[PDB]
Structure 1
Amino acid sequence: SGFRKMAFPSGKVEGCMVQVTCGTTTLNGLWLDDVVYCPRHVICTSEDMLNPNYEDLLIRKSNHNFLVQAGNVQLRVIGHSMQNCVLKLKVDTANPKTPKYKFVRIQPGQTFSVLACYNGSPSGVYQCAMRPNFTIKGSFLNGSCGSVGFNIDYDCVSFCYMHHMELPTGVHAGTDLEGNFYGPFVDRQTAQAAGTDTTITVNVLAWLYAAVINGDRWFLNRFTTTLNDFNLVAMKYNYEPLTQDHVDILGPLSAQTGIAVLDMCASLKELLQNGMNGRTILGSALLEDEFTPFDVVRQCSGVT
């Protein structure tokens, strides 16, 4: 028992972190095989950040301008290319610690672990989710750019995020490993306001199942609801609409606890309409939405 915000073990990703310096900017790179991935804004100066033309800025850069340091040993750069908002630096040495990996683009609501890094060195690991407005609420400082977000399926690391920037509101924006930003964000020092940060309903429901499994049951009520009725209440509370697919994904949790998904929706409806009354659920005073149904099943079953 006990339910914690749990990150994936970071070792496989730690073995991929390198330092990339270009000009006077130092950030992090991800070394997989003979390629190092890093944000393209590494080639920018103070005056470039405002309205950079990366194709133009990249012409003035050569292979020897990208300084790649793995641990404290230098990697030789034999090629460089720009793929969307990331640079792919081909090095002469394949990463000996390269795990089995995939590049995946995640959907809003999906969770992942971040291994925050500074100067190619890991400083910490935390769990977070892709918000429905395509921001992430990370914990990043200057120099953390190039830190990655990932998932693990036993031995395969699915890389889903690369950190690029902090928006003026302190929230975070980044790309998948193909260089495409999540959301409408652009790697420019400009006014980019995020959209509505709605609550990931399916995740909240999965965490209510996690609470019942671990003994916090006070919130279970004598009511039920429909998808349409629940969604009227969810729209009012800035909660994402619940679909039949979400209900299906919750099936394993409904089966283990014997609580119908729509009964759990009714319990959530009353928590939304009445508050917690100073009470807590899994040590939290708000409804937690950064655990997917898959994360709850994994933590409650002990997948390694």
Structure 2
Amino acid sequence: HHSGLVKMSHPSGDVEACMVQVTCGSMTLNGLWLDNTVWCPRHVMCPADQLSDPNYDALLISMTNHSFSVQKHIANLRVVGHAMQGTLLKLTVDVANPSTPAYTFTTVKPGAAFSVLACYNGRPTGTFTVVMRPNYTIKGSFLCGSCGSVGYTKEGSVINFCYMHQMELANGTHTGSAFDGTMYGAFMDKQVHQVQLTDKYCSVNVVAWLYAAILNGCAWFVKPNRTSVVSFNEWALANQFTEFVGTQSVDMLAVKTGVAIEQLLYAIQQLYTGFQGKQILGSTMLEDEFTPEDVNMQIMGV
């Protein structure tokens, strides 16, 4: 009856120990302290009268190490170097974080889930998980002062940082930077109207959810009928779905349930025209916020 699915985040302690406050004049936000480096959004440099068209190159040149104040309240970290990488600053500090976890930097892909640690004034305040939408936004929960909050995944003990928060778009969704300094999607870290690409249903995550339903004894939508991946993907382009790309994680769900991917691609095509008053796992609309990995881990223990 209950699916056994929740929105599951990584434990956040490893990352909490890396959060600091960064102040530059009238601007304050959060940074990430790893080894002798503090990462933060570059718009910490920007006076509010200039957030709509900052000249970041000129702002950077105008700064000295004194221009940045970094504090940990969970130490004052003296800045001894400063540099800009895309939309992020790299501040060099005189003390290496003694609690630096094993970490990498990676870019997250549409449909994939990651954990966010929402922070204000360098203080962690909550944690949640989101999927990167096909239009490179996330449906998060961020208020003024939240920039520099980070998103990450975890492989073993290694934290893979993938997101640093920057902006809330007009429709209430959120976007930010990867740690290579790029913004996700076509977004810019300028406080002006920006075009939003269309969101889409993440087909591989809808497939995962339908498997979750079968793993819970809910399979009324499973029929012998099948749609091929190539045929579904042509259909997807006309109906606001991502093209489906199967993975080993989806294959494990097909094996466990004995229901083939192509059967669920046909189910999705029919469900999209309407559930006809039936429910799947308590919903009367397709759910794409759980991944194949979520289902394998939370339900099957993998």
Q: Please give the secondary structure, in 1, of the residue aligned with 2:220.
A: coil
Is residue 267 from structure 1 mapped to residue 274 from structure 2 by the alignment? no
The one-letter code matched in structure 2 to 1:127 is T
Name the CA distance, whole Å, in 1 between partners of 2:153 and 2:109. 13
The answer to whether the 8 A contact 1:3-1:282 is kept is no
The answer to whether the 8 A contact 2:74-2:123 is kept is no
Q: Please give the secondary structure, in 1, of the residue aligned with 2:10.
A: coil
1:129 to 128, 131, 151: 131
The one-letter code matched in structure 1 to 2:164 is M
What's the CA shift for 1:232?
A: 4.1
Aligned runs of 1:51-62 on 2, under 5 Å? Answer: 51-62=53-64
Question: What's the RMSD between the two structures over aligned residues?
Answer: 1.7
Name the CA distance, whole Å, in 1 between partners of 2:247 and 2:41. 38
User: Which residue matches 1:297?
Assistant: 296
Q: Please give the secondary structure, in 2, of the residue aligned with 1:5.
A: coil
Name the CA distance, whole Å, in 1 between partners of 2:225 and 2:211. 16
Name the CA distance, whole Å, in 1 between partners of 2:113 and 2:32. 20
User: Which residue matches 1:182?
Assistant: 184
Is residue 282 from structure 1 mapped to residue 274 from structure 2 by the alignment? no
Name the CA distance, whole Å, in 2 between partners of 1:11 and 1:278. 43
Inter-CA distance 64–279: structure 2 relative to 1 (3 Å threshold): farther
User: Which residue matches 2:8?
Assistant: 6
Is residue 100 from structure 1 mapped to residue 99 from structure 2 by the alignment? no
Which segment is superposed worse, 233-242 or 12-21? 233-242
Post-superposition Cα deviations, 1:27-59, rounded to whole Å, max 9, x if no partner, equal 110111111110000011122112111110112
Name the CA distance, whole Å, in 1 between partners of 2:153 and 2:10. 7
Is residue 16 from structure 1 mapped to residue 18 from structure 2 by the alignment? yes
What's the CA shift for 1:180?
A: 0.7
What's the CA shift for 1:72?
A: 6.1
What's the CA shift for 1:64?
A: 1.6
Name structure 2 gaps, 5 residues minimum: none
Name the CA distance, whole Å, in 1 between partners of 2:276 and 2:23. 52
Q: Please give the secondary structure, in 2, of the residue aligned with 1:87.
A: strand
2:233 to 231, 234, 242: 231
The one-letter code matched in structure 1 to 2:262 is L
What's the CA shift for 1:248?
A: 5.2
The one-letter code matched in structure 2 to 1:277 is Q
Q: Please give the secondary structure, in 2, of the residue aligned with 1:280.
A: coil
1:29 to 28, 31, 34: 31
The one-letter code matched in structure 1 to 2:299 is C
Post-superposition Cα deviations, 1:161-220, rounded to whole Å, max 9, x if no partner, equal 110111222221211112111111111111102101011101110121122112332332
1:154 to 156, 160, 175: 156
Name structure 1 gaps, 5 residues minimum: none
The one-letter code matched in structure 2 to 1:256 is K
The one-letter code matched in structure 2 to 1:168 is A
What's the CA shift for 1:285?
A: 3.3
The answer to whether the 8 A contact 2:104-2:158 is kept is yes
Q: Please give the secondary structure, in 2, of the residue aligned with 1:195.
A: coil
The one-letter code matched in structure 1 to 2:289 is E
What's the CA shift for 1:221?
A: 2.8
The answer to whether the 8 A contact 1:10-1:125 is kept is yes
Name the CA distance, whole Å, in 2 between partners of 1:236 and 1:150. 33
Name the CA distance, whole Å, in 2 between partners of 1:281 and 1:177. 38
The answer to whether the 8 A contact 2:4-2:298 is kept is no
The one-letter code matched in structure 2 to 1:36 is V
Name the CA distance, whole Å, in 2 between partners of 1:298 and 1:95. 32
2:112 to 110, 115, 138: 110
The answer to whether the 8 A contact 2:117-2:125 is kept is yes
TM-score by structure 2 length?
A: 0.94
